[PDB]
Design a binder for this molecule. Structure first.
Ligand SMILES: NC(=O)N1CCN(c2ccc(F)cc2)CC1
Ligand SMILES: NC(=O)N1CCN(c2ccc(F)cc2)CC1
Ligand SMILES: NC(=O)N1CCN(c2ccc(F)cc2)CC1
Lengths: 412, 412
């Protein structure tokens, strides 16, 4: 037997806005967050654009002195997490602090910091490496710093499952609460890889869209002219809470987390299998986990990265899992607007899945001008679609063939 | 309802050996694996030694053509993983591959790789960054590559909780099996942070021993002349298996994992509290999880990093948890011999804890010539101590105030 887990606070930094309601406003308007990257020489790079967080002010959250110690990915993680805790109204007390934990992850961690400390190392030698290099760059420091700032003494950890991080972080946090290891968890992910090493590293594998002329049209999941993913920055955090705990203090409940699925493709380091066999098993696992029949699913927030092999794999997976229901559900890539926030993708897409439930609206797949061969599902081309949504899925399918699926349900 | 979990396979690279047996022989003979570092010129560094893996042949495991693309931490993770699975005698099949997963972690991941690609980027341009940069450097690719080579389709993930990584990886993997998400898990961690940025970054914070002129005597946990930890490399992997699944196949069972604790200090980014309050919460959680009287605990493999504040915190935590029984159990730090394998520390030390149960011997704390103020427990100074061990506990503490405790006992 198992406790029920609800969403009582959400927080976000995205290429679309500095919080949830502003990000969600852009999502439903089909606005693009993608733009050429500024204050950075990308002359020798084949990709010169992505989704930046615009106008982030870390001094709303931290002193200038504490923020100087921390990589951007950690700043962004703390911002979404502080937002999510404030959004929840939860009061931390000596009576509950041991029951409140954190699992905020990252796919790639502190590349920006690693790059600036490399610059100092090569130019001037090791004696110019920042004393805060290690604690200021390691992925578990969003969980670390958040626990220290708020006095959280519950489970304290960090996932790193590349592009699956945010989905796994939220799912495993839900498990902690369901099986009684915590009553509250702050979970999600953050990322800032759209630095030299992120653009160069992914650009070297030719994984990135090179559509420098039309950056807002670059991210075009299931469109026959897609040429790979758009690199994006930001964070999502959710406050996950045991139902009775949330009801007792009179929390505002956005939605219930009913289902979590995991699988491994065991196929290829970067490419999914053509038929999405792994993504199929993971969605089936998530629906079994939630005790739901595939027929009950109304809305899927796809992984939808705009990679040719990735997008077609997800069409196959859904047709295989949903059979004659596959056309009835709506499925959209919000990455058409946000780009791919990698380890944070699952976190911001879980929030969009929750908000699709609250507002009864499927977010668009923008730029889906010419669906590809086989891409005949309801991919919500171009514009948001108001519709009935009781059950929403959020999928992540990342490098190493690691799969995550979250099942959200309306709560009333 | 909650199932029991046993250890059926173990694997290791350490500064003492290229497998578990050779490493364990070094542990029981009090041998140091710490030496001046040869793979690079450290004359501008304030620390020039640590625990290298000596004579590692990746060609025992992988083609030189796959090896070339992978960071040593991934190479070390796979080697220990391959050892653990072979040691288990487990055969992967279509009937069970969905029921076998992997959780192999790292604190820092592919810092060597990311540094060298940073050098290429700075000296030559983005066009000289390896196409394998991302899949060859990111922390989740031990779990990824292991699943690809063995065909593991179970839960596929990675923890990154700094120096607590291996302990958390093992504990959460046991929970997966406990709660029916998997019947088999390959779990542990790997680390190779001995690059310029690693030795430099830990050196900038003055966290490392600077005993360059006597490296084998540098790691001296609870000794009054200790002066920081010794950075070491390697990997530990265990096969965790549901008890009845292990019984059904006549598996050889080394020990039972009965207990898993996590807590957060919520104290400091890098310093443990003097009183050991977070470590004490974590051990109490693990002992209650195991349904034990604290007097049943015979052996503690301490975190024991040879830092001033870390070592004394641990005495205080153990005195607070076990009271008068603190004076009857044996506690030692195998870090005295191996140094600090960071995210891999929890993995090798869990294997040392299991082997203490198999052979009925407490490994020594070497170099404990002058125990510090209040360091007055049985710390097994200098020499291995044959003794009765029914219950063994392995502790890790890390940056972000993240704590882990594992509880093992003999299985008949
Ligand atoms: N070249 C190869 O045979 N592999 C597979 C493709 N590849 C890759 C793809 C996308 C990405 F973002 C990172 C790496 C590089 C390694
Ligand atoms: N401000 C200072 O003098 N430093 C930097 C922060 N902190 C630290 C400790 C251990 C470590 F491995 C990395 C960083 C304490 C020492
Ligand atoms: N006086 C002591 O220090 N003891 C008493 C408790 N004891 C124990 C043994 C088996 C068991 F099932 C429960 C408890 C072990 C050590």
């Amino acid at each position: 037997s198992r406790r029920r887990v609800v969403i009582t606070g959400m927080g976000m930094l995205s290429p679309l806005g500095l919080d949830v309601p502003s990000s969600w406003e852009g999502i439903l308007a089909g606005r693009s967050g993608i733009a050429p990257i500024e204050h950075m020489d990308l002359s020798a790079y084949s990709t010169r654009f992505g989704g930046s967080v615009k106008g982030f002010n870390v001094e709303e959250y931290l002193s200038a002195k504490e923020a100087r110690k921390l990589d951007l990915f950690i700043q962004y993680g703390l911002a979404a997490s502080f937002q999510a805790v404030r959004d929840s109204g939860l009061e931390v007390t000596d009576a509950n602090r041991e029951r409140i934990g954190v699992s905020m992850g990252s796919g790639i961690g502190g590349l920006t910091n690693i790059e600036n400390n490399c610059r100092s190392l090569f130019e001037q030698g090791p004696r110019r490496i920042s004393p805060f290099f290690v604690p200021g760059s390691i992925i578990n420091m969003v969980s670390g710093f958040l626990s220290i700032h708020l006095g959280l003494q519950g489970p304290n950890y960090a996932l790193t499952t590349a592009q699956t991080t945010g989905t796994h972080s939220i799912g495993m946090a839900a498990r902690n609460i369901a099986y009684g290891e915590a009553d509250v968890m702050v979970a999600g992910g953050s990322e800032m890889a759209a630095c030299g090493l992120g653009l160069g590293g992914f650009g070297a594998a030719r994984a990135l869209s090179t559509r420098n002329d039309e950056p807002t049209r670059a991210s075009r999941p299931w469109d026959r002219d897609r040429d790979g993913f758009v690199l994006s920055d930001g964070s999502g955090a959710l406050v996950l809470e045991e139902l009775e705990h949330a009801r007792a203090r009179g929390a505002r409940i956005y939605a219930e987390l009913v289902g979590f699925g995991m699988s491994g493709d065991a196929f290829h380091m970067t490419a999914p299998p053509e038929d999405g066999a792994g993504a199929a098993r993971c969605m089936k696992n998530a629906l079994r986990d939630a005790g739901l029949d595939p027929r009950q699913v109304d809305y899927i927030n796809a992984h939808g990265t705009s990679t040719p092999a990735g997008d077609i794999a997800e069409i196959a997976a859904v047709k295989s899992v949903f059979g004659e229901h596959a056309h009835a559900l709506s499925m959209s890539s919000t990455k058409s607007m946000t780009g791919h926030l990698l380890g944070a993708a699952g976190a911001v897409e879980a929030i969009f899945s929750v908000l699709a439930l609250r507002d009864q609206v499927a977010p668009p797949t923008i730029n889906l001008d010419n669906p590809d061969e086989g891409c005949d599902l309801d991919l919500v081309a171009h514009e948001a679609k108001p519709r009935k949504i009781d059950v929403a899925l959020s999928n992540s399918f990342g490098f190493g063939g690691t799969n995550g699926t979250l099942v959200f349900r309306r709560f009333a």
